[PDB]
Design a binder for this molecule. Structure first.
Ligand SMILES: CCCCCCCCCCCCCCCCCC(=O)OC[C@H](COP(=O)([O-])OCC(O)COP(=O)([O-])OC[C@@H](COC(=O)CCCCCCCCCCCCCCCCC)OC(=O)CCCCCCCCCCCCCCCCC)OC(=O)CCCCCCCCCCCCCCCCC
Ligand SMILES: CCCCC/C=C/C/C=C/C/C=C\C/C=C\CCCC(=O)O[C@H](COC(=O)CCCCCCCCCCCCCCCCC)COP(=O)(O)O[C@@H]1[C@H](O)[C@H](O)[C@@H](O)[C@H](O)[C@H]1O
Ligand SMILES: CCCCC/C=C/C/C=C/C/C=C\C/C=C\CCCC(=O)O[C@H](COC(=O)CCCCCCCCCCCCCCCCC)COP(=O)(O)O[C@@H]1[C@H](O)[C@H](O)[C@@H](O)[C@H](O)[C@H]1O
Ligand SMILES: CCCCC/C=C/C/C=C/C/C=C\C/C=C\CCCC(=O)O[C@H](COC(=O)CCCCCCCCCCCCCCCCC)COP(=O)(O)O[C@@H]1[C@H](O)[C@H](O)[C@@H](O)[C@H](O)[C@H]1O
Ligand SMILES: CCCCC/C=C/C/C=C\CCCCCCCC(=O)O[C@H](COC(=O)CCCCCCCCCCCCCCC)COP(=O)([O-])OCC[N+](C)(C)C
Ligand SMILES: CCCCCCCCCCCCCCCCCC(=O)OC[C@H](COP(=O)(O)OCCN)OC(=O)CCCCCCCCCCCCCCCCC
Ligand SMILES: CCCCCCCCCCCCCCCCCC(=O)OC[C@H](COP(=O)(O)OCCN)OC(=O)CCCCCCCCCCCCCCCCC
Ligand SMILES: CCCCCCCCCCCCCCCCCC(=O)OC[C@H](COP(=O)(O)OCCN)OC(=O)CCCCCCCCCCCCCCCCC
Ligand SMILES: CCCCCCCCCCCCCCCCCC(=O)OC[C@H](COP(=O)(O)OCCN)OC(=O)CCCCCCCCCCCCCCCCC
Ligand SMILES: CCCCCCCCCCCC(=O)OC[C@H](COP(=O)(O)OCC[N+](C)(C)C)OC(=O)CCCCCCCCCCC
Lengths: 171, 469, 340, 86, 117, 135, 86, 60
């Protein structure tokens, strides 16, 4: 779909869902927290996302109205994993997504906070971040040490926390 | 081969001196001959009327386009021979017929444009090929810039071709706006029934047809043909006609069109009637070309027009080349050269040619009676096939008009022979000079084809039945 | 709205005053290369010289010759000045720090540049002084010919980035400045930026010795101010193009360690300090380029028309097509086609 | 569809009823191509289809080469006569 | 109303303001001798082909250069395929450039003295 | 303020009618300057419909080269409903109009590109052939 | 020696550009609300930012990381009503 | 790219929910306006049975 052109007004619809449709909770995180949590959401909810997309394909055009149920499933899985992060690893999650807010949302600028967040989530939620499609020879960039590309300013709080973790031995 | 020739030729003509023009042109003449003979066997691909879409559905290859392609190569070979070889070795003819430095590259590029028009499967390819041919043909018109008439001609041609190209682009874009497509292959019987595309498709056909000069927009082209150098006119009057007509025949977008019917009628009448009062040779020949373009336009109103159109276009190409070559040869016996671009201009300048060269007039008679359609020359069978097609499809009034137009045009066809078999007081006594062997052999080959082609008619139809069915 | 206004006034004032002081800097630098002093009397240390010339020219009568199209003669300098200044809207002094953050920033730069030959093309027709006509035709020829070289170097650089956002092109250069792998391309951009700006040695367009004055022979008062201002603003702007295409724009060095020492959290102090560092890097690059324009003016004699046309179309353009062939070939060999 | 159509038709009428100059003729050609292209591009946008824009790019390039060749023809025409009296 | 459009609007206003200041403040005393065109102090057209030719050949070469914009914006997506296509395109154009060079398109008494003894 | 952006399309249309001053110009120059004005109006309209990159390409080519040539030469010679704009998330790449044009032109239509190369080759050879007198 | 009077205008230009850029950094940060700017943003980013506006109450680029969305998020959805491109 | 892929299903799902709501809502609105008239509001303009979100609103 194309973006809007010369003159447009945004308009809001005040109707409710039809009551036959089961209600569902909506994901409340914004762009930076969502981008921070994306890899864990994928790792956990991959089967449900795949099922949702397969339903949308097989519906062959009526996807919006035939694929509501596993859409509810997808949103519920996403909300569950975000809640788990909010319960178990909140401080590192905030480090990561505030760092992203500062660095134009480039994951390359938040490797230090991302290491802490990844360790916390692996230990307390058993989710691993992994980049699909790479051969064993190719190395995931977020695991690479001494990258060519570095942020302008290493985030202050993230640097302090990373050095602290290096002392504690958690990282 | 054609692209490779163009590239190499650009390199050489850059690095060669002005005296090497004719040797270069002989080189390309032989190269085209070699391609025609060595690569001819690719016909075998088209057995059972097998069609191939190529280049991501931009180009279409079938027996029809293969034949048009071979015909265009044959025409290019003949036309390049006229530049690559001197009729006579005297000073006068060095002045009369010298090839420009870039002329051969322009010829090859215009040929490429014509071949891409023929093969075009998509409208973008059609438009790019049309513009390629149009630009190259503008430049060919203009390359002899010492002529006032040639420059005036090139400018008028630029403007008329530009307007017709804009009409064509508009038609293409309206077709896009209605169907969100650039291919005619998307069209079907259901779609034609469902939607009224008649206006768009007829605008596209008219934009293409006014570029070869059908009435009522003829006169600008006849003026251009009159005002160009004679060896340029032999080319620019033929190749665009072939390419555009072949594309339209292959596309079949004006079947039973009432507007095309009326315009074909008008073209026949204007080509036949308007050529009667002519006194200049090339204007006479241009009105001939207009009438014959009318005969071919009739074939755009019906399906299964492949045989009649191919036969007609081939025999017309041969007759047209031959009549221009005869006019060229008859230059050696005129007593007044009008100028260096058009040595002979008035029909009456041939008066008494039979006393100077009897067999030149024999060849002239043969080609003229082919144009009139006297059996068993090729022209008769061309007209016979056309009449067969249009009567099979119920174009009765158009058939009557075609009869009448052939009758009328016979008058200014026979005008040439009439003045040619009259008597001149000063009759050649002797000469040491020999006409060039090569061009005389080529002219003779064309004459013998026109005379004795009919013996192969049944063999041709047998071949046709297996490659186009 | 208020913030937008303040940003525009700050940027506009900085650009206009930088152009004004570039003229003084030129006179002073040439002066010291010629063992003399240059303006040191109008204002302390000659710092008000440019405003003195300005005020004088704004008080000067406008002369409209008899055979002239007065509308065209007055509007041609105006349009060339407008385009020369409009070109500044996309120049960043830091990541995203610009008046116009366009995803088509490069295309905007090239287009507004291509709108730069119209002053030369129109003034000769407007003046009707014959010297102006000769200058105008020769200039139009030279400028378009060298615009080709500039556009070709633009394309070669985008081969490495695959983006028309200027900030992105600058950001990709943290790894290395593009003037390191493409040093010969940097030399050609200077030689061509000199020519495209119509500066010596390539000042054939308005050379006093071949043609008195130049296309401006007839321009007095504010129209002369406009041609003058447009010329120096274009000098700075094309130095800016050079800066962000090849010299890494506002990138100087990795100051992450230093900031982590100085500060412990984000603050307006630290944002301001970062802004000053980026802007200082970009402005020092601009200063070296402007100094180089003045240096080359001091060192070399002029070309002739035939000479510069021969240069551009027989020595430079073949090399640039050769580079067109050799840059994607090297990308292909090492499997480094840049992503979007 | 509106701006392009009107540019096309007004440029066409300027071309036909030109009895002032040949430069007007060149300009009407160029502006006709402009109007064709504007109609094309609006249709491209409405369909969210790339074929329209591809053909628009090709028209741009061909109009460039057509302008080059046409001006060269005009210059060659001028070389013989010294003056264009239209 | 972002900074872009406001700046774009603002620049011509500044130009017009400087022009109006000049018109308002400067004297204006035209007379015939002042209105004469300046040619070194006293009152008082064939050209070469290369003048025409630089301008005319600018347009094809400009189009060639600007035809590579789609390529450089899609280099990765077209991979080693588009790569080869754009090489062929470039070489075809280079041929025309060679023609231009070899024809010397843009470029603008040695007899002995013999006595009949 | 809102009626401005609403009628912006209709204003470009009106200015285009008015500028097509090209036909009635006393001076052909002046006619060429008005042609440039028409081209700027075209660039304005193109941005409005969502094709700004085309606005910039038009400025680059038709004004930067074609209008420059025009001037060079002549100095030398003597539907009331509103559309619903909806979002979806299936596009993860940063693919714009220029990238898609490059993609299709260099892969699906490489043939059109090479034929355009031949057309530009013509645009070089022709002018040399007719404006230059060899030897 | 190094001629400082020749360097004074260069110093003026350098300070002018440096101060102008620093002031522009501070104004951009202040407009953004304490974070740096977003550059080179595609369609995806624009849509994400619109969704952010729906989530955080229209407070610009403010971010919320609560798992569950407020009630008003379900009703403040916006489609755009775009005028006919004539 | 992989991050965006992992986010796409949930964002889409939300958008499909909004689409169904606003399409249905407009259907009931138009039906209510058309009560008392011999017109069927539920009949699609399309011949396939597939769901078709409205385009082309009435100007507001
Ligand atoms: C960098 C440019 C300098 C490079 C060469 C310096 C040579 C030199 O100093 O000896 C002069 C010397 C003259 O001998 P002298 O006059 O008898 O003795 C000198 C005086 O006693 C003593 O002369 P001095 O007191 O001027 O030298 C001391 C100088 C430093 O002495 C040094 O040489 C230090 C080493 C080099 C670092 C340069 C520091 C200053 C940089 C300039 C910008 C300052 C900010 O420190 C200063 O005083 C700086 C000047 C005051 C500030 C200027 C005002 C700046 C306003 C804003 C500027 C922003 C734009 C820039 O000349 C030479 O020996 C040969 C010079 C050949 C130079 C060739 C090219 C060199 C490299 C290219 C530079 C590109 C420009
Ligand atoms: C560069 C110049 C650029 C300028 C651009 C601006 C111009 C734009 C439009 C002009 C475009 C070019 C104009 C070309 C001439 C238009 C004439 C034209 O197409 O043939 C007509 C249009 O049949 C209309 O029904 C169409 C009827 C005509 C429309 C009505 C007239 C409106 C005027 C109101 C006053 C095509 O019918 P046709 O021959 O197939 O006729 C019959 C018949 O229609 C069918 O029933 C038969 O079944 C069929 O077999 C066929 O035989
Ligand atoms: C099915 C339809 C397709 C094709 C049908 C067309 C043609 C038939 C096919 C092939 C034609 C090939 C023919 C080759 C044999 C023809 C042949 O005797 O040599 C030439 C012509 O030679 C072409 O000019 C050769 C030019 C070839 C071009 C002909 C194409 C028309 C004629 O001899 P010629 O005694 O005058 O030649 C003599 C002798 O060679 C010299 O040494 C003398 O000094 C000189 O006075 C000269 O007169
Ligand atoms: C920064 C500038 C600072 C300098 C400010 C003022 C000094 C320059 C003032 C100056 O030379 O004009 C003097 C007038 O003298 C005053 O007494 C006229 C009153 C002077 C107005 C002062 C305005 C100061 C701020 C301007 C902004 C000469 O005009 P003038 O008598 O021929 O009167 C007019 C005038 O020049 C033209 O606008 C007319 O078109 C023309 O007809 C002519 O007759
Ligand atoms: C050693 C290789 C030399 C071959 C070079 C061919 C050059 C073509 C140049 C000019 C065209 C000139 C005449 C073309 C003949 C049609 C062939 C054919 O039969 O037409 C059919 C299709 O019938 C048609 O639609 C009607 C054709 C209309 C012909 C009108 C003239 C009739 C009289 C000509 C008599 C022939 C002279 C023989 C004298 C002994 C295509 O046949 P095809 O596609 O299967 O290819 C043939 C196999 N080939 C490639 C190896 C040669
Ligand atoms: C005419 C004017 C020519 C002046 C050109 C100045 C060249 C020196 C700066 C090169 C800048 C560059 O592109 O790379 C510098 C970069 C700095 O590294 P860093 O600050 O640690 O950032 C980490 C992320 N890479 O990474 C590097 O440090 C790499 C080493 C610098 C690049 C090579 C230096 C040797 C060649 C200098 C010759 C320049 C032209 C003469
Ligand atoms: C941005 C700043 C805008 C300032 C423009 C104001 C122009 C005022 C100058 C004026 O009154 O007319 C000047 C103009 C000069 O041309 P003219 O005098 O007719 O012939 C000279 C040939 N040597 O005389 C004219 O021909 C007038 C042409 C312009 C029409 C504007 C009418 C102004 C009337 C003043 C009230
Ligand atoms: C309105 C149509 C176009 C729509 C909007 C414009 C689009 C953008 C324009 C881009 C600017 C470049 C081209 C400008 C158009 C050229 C105008 C022109 O043709 O001027 C020359 C002409 C001279 O004619 P003249 O001899 O004086 O007629 C005598 C009759 N008694 O003079 C005249 O014929 C009349 C006087 C015209 C004065 C021009 C004033 C504007 C100058 C450009 C300003 C650009 C914006 C800055 C936020
Ligand atoms: C107008 C004449 C020519 C326009 C040139 C087009 C320049 C351009 O590229 O505009 C792009 C820019 C918005 O483009 P974009 O990069 O996608 O912005 C995203 C920022 N995050 O556009 C902008 O940012 C602001 C728009 C500037 C042009 C508006 C002019 C309105 C034209 C109607 C005139 C009415 C008469
Ligand atoms: C950045 C700006 C740097 C320049 C400021 C110092 C110049 C100066 O203030 O110089 C003193 C000026 C007049 O200069 P002067 O008459 O030539 O005396 C110079 C002495 N001699 C011997 C060199 C002749 O006095 C003034 O009225 C200052 C008011 C001007 C305000 C406008 C400034 C625009 C910015």
């Amino acid at each position: 779909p194309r973006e809007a052109a010369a003159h447009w007004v945004p308009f809001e619809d005040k109707a409710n869902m039809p009551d036959n449709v089961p209600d569902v909770v909506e994901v409340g995180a914004t762009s930076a927290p969502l981008l921070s949590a994306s890899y864990f959401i994928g790792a956990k909810c991959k089967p449900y996302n795949d099922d949702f997309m397969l339903c949308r394909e097989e519906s062959q055009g009526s996807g919006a109205i035939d694929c509501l149920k596993e859409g509810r499933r997808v949103t519920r899985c996403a909300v569950s994993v975000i809640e788990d992060i909010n319960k178990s690893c909140l401080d590192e999650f905030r480090l990561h997504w505030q760092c992203l807010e500062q660095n134009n949302h480039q994951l390359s600028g938040c490797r230090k906070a991302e290491a802490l967040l990844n360790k916390c989530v692996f230990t307390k939620l058993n989710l691993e971040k992994k980049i699909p499609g790479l051969r064993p020879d190719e190395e995931p960039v977020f695991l690479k040490k001494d990258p060519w590309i570095k942020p302008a300013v290493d985030d202050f709080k993230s640097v302090r926390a990373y050095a602290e973790a290096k002392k504690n031995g958690t990282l | 081969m054609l692209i490779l020739a163009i590239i190499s030729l650009i390199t050489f003509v850059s690095m060669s001196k002005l005296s090497d023009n004719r040797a270069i042109i002989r080189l390309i003449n032989i190269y085209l001959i070699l391609v025609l003979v060595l690569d001819s066997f690719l016909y075998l691909l088209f057995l059972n009327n097998q069609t191939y879409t190529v280049m991501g559905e931009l180009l279409i290859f079938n027996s029809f386009t293969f034949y048009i392609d071979m015909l265009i190569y044959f025409i290019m070979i003949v036309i390049s021979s006229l530049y690559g070889y001197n009729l006579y070795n005297n000073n006068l003819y060095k002045t009369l017929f010298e090839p420009k430095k870039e002329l051969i590259i322009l010829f090859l590029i215009n040929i490429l444009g014509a071949l891409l028009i023929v093969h075009s499967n998509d409208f973008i390819t059609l438009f790019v090929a049309i513009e390629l041919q149009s630009y190259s043909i503008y430049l060919i018109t203009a390359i002899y810039n010492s002529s006032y008439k040639a420059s005036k001609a090139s400018m008028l041609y630029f403007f008329m071709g530009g307007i017709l190209s804009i009409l064509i682009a508009y038609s293409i874009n309206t077709y896009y706006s209605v169907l969100n497509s650039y291919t005619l292959h998307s069209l079907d019987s259901l779609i034609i029934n469902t939607l009224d595309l008649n206006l768009i498709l007829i605008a596209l056909s008219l934009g293409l047809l006014f570029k070869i000069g059908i009435a009522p927009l003829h006169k600008w082209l006849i003026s251009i043909y009159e005002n160009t150098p004679i060896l340029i006119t032999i080319y620019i009057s033929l190749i665009p006609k072939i390419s555009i007509l072949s594309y339209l025949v292959l596309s079949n977008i004006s079947i039973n069109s009432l507007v095309i019917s009326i315009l074909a009628i008008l073209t026949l009448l204007v080509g036949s009637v308007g050529g009667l009062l002519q006194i200049k040779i090339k204007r006479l020949l241009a009105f001939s070309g207009l009438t014959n373009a009318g005969y071919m336009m009739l074939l755009l109103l019906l399906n299964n027009n492949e045989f009649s159109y191919l036969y007609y276009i081939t025999q017309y190409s041969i007759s047209h080349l031959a009549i221009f070559m005869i006019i060229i040869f008859s230059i050696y016996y005129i007593n007044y050269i009008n100028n260096q671009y058009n040595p002979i201009i008035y029909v009456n300048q041939l008066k008494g040619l039979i006393h100077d060269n009897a067999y030149l007039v024999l060849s002239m008679a043969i080609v003229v009676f082919s144009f009139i359609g006297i059996p068993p020359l090729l022209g008769f069978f061309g007209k016979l096939n056309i009449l067969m097609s249009i009567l099979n499809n119920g174009y009765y009034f158009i058939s009557i008009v075609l009869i009448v137009a052939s009758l009328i045009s016979a008058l200014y066809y026979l005008y040439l022979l009439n003045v040619s078999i009259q008597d001149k007081n000063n009759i050649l006594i002797n000469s040491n000079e020999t006409v060039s062997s090569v061009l005389s052999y080529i002219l003779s080959s064309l004459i013998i084809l026109i005379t004795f082609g009919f013996i192969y008619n049944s063999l041709i139809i047998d071949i046709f039945n297996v490659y186009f069915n | 709205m208020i913030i937008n206004i303040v940003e525009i006034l700050i940027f506009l004032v900085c650009v206009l005053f930088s152009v004004a002081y570039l003229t003084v800097a030129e006179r002073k630098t040439l002066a010291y290369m010629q063992r003399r002093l240059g303006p040191n009397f109008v204002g302390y240390y000659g710092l008000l010289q440019a405003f003195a010339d300005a005020v004088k020219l704004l008080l000067k009568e406008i002369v409209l010759p008899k055979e002239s199209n007065y509308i065209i003669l007055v509007i041609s300098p105006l349009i060339t000045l407008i385009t020369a200044l409009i070109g500044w809207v996309v120049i960043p002094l830091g990541p995203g720090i610009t008046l116009g953050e366009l995803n088509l920033g490069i295309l905007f730069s090239l287009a507004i540049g291509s709108l730069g030959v119209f002053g030369s093309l129109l003034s000769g027709w407007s003046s009707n002084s014959k010297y102006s006509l000769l200058g105008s035709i020769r200039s139009t020829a030279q400028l378009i010919s060298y615009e080709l070289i500039l556009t070709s170097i633009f394309i070669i650089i985008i081969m490495f980035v695959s983006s028309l956002n200027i900030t992105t092109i600058i950001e990709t250069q943290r790894v290395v400045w593009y003037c390191i792998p493409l040093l010969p391309l940097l030399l050609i951009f200077f030689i061509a930026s000199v020519a495209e700006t119509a500066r010596p040695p390539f000042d054939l367009t308005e050379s006093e010795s071949e043609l008195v004055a130049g296309y401006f022979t007839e321009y007095s008062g504010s129209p002369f101010v406009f041609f003058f201002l447009a010329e120096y603003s274009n000098i700075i702007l094309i130095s800016a193009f050079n800066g962000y295409l090849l010299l890494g724009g506002y990138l100087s060095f990795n100051y992450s360690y230093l900031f982590n020492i100085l500060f412990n959290d984000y603050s307006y102090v630290s944002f301001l300090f970062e802004g000053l560092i980026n802007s200082s890097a970009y402005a020092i690059k601009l200063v070296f380029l402007m100094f180089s324009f003045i240096w080359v003016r001091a060192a070399f004699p002029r070309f002739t028309y035939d000479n510069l046309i021969n240069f551009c179309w027989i020595i430079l353009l073949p090399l640039l097509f050769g580079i067109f062939l050799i840059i994607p070939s090297t990308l292909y060999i090492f499997d480094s086609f840049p992503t979007l | 569809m509106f701006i392009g159509t009107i540019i096309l038709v007004l440029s066409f009428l300027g071309f036909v009823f030109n009895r002032r100059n040949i430069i007007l003729a060149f300009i009407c050609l160029e502006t006709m191509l402009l109007g064709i292209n504007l109609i094309l591009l609006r249709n491209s946008v409405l369909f969210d289809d790339i074929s329209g824009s591809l053909f628009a790019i090709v028209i741009i390039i061909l109009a460039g080469v057509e302008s080059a060749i046409g001006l060269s023809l005009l210059v060659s025409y001028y070389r013989l006569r010294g003056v264009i009296n239209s | 109303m972002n900074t872009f459009i406001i700046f774009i609007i603002l620049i011509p206003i500044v130009g017009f303001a400087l022009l109006a200041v000049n018109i308002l403040l400067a004297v204006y005393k035209p007379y015939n001798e002042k209105l004469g065109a300046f040619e070194c102090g006293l009152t008082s057209l064939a050209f070469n082909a290369a003048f025409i030719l630089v301008a005319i050949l600018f347009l094809p070469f400009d189009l060639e250069i600007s035809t590579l914009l789609p390529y450089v914006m899609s280099i990765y997506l077209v991979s080693n395929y588009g790569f080869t296509i754009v090489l062929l395109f470039l070489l075809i154009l280079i041929i025309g450039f060679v023609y231009e060079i070899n024809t010397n398109a843009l470029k603008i008494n040695t007899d002995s003295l013999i006595y009949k003894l | 303020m809102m009626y401005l952006t609403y009628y912006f399309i209709e204003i470009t249309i009106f200015l285009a009618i008015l500028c097509t001053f090209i036909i009635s110009a006393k001076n052909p120059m002046v006619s060429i300057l008005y042609m440039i004005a028409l081209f700027v109006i075209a660039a304005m309209y193109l941005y409005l419909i969502g094709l700004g990159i085309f606005s910039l390409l038009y400025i680059m080519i038709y004004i930067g080269a074609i209008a420059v040539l025009f001037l060079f030469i002549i100095t030398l010679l003597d539907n009331d409903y509103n559309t619903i704009i909806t979002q979806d998330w299936f596009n993860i790449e940063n693919t714009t109009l220029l990238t898609t044009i490059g993609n299709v032109l260099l892969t699906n239509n490489a043939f059109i590109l090479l034929v355009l190369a031949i057309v530009l080759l013509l645009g070089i050879i022709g002018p040399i052939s007719i404006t230059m007198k060899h030897k | 020696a190094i001629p400082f009077e020749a360097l004074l205008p260069y110093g003026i230009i350098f300070g002018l550009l440096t101060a102008g850029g620093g002031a522009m950094q501070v104004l951009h940060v202040y407009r953004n609300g304490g974070v740096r700017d977003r550059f080179a943003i595609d369609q995806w980013d624009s849509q994400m930012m619109e969704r952010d506006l729906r989530l955080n109450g229209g407070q610009g680029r403010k971010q919320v990381d609560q798992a569950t969305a407020p009630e008003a998020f379900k009703h403040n959805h916006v489609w755009k009503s775009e005028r006919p491109l004539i | 790219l992989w991050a965006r892929i992992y986010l796409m299903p949930l964002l889409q799902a939300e958008e499909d929910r909004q689409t169904v709501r606003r399409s249905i809502a407009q259907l009931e609105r138009e039906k209510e306006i058309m009560k008392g008239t011999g017109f069927d509001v539920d009949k699609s303009v399309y011949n396939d049975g597939k769901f078709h979100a409205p385009a082309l609103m009435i100007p507001p």
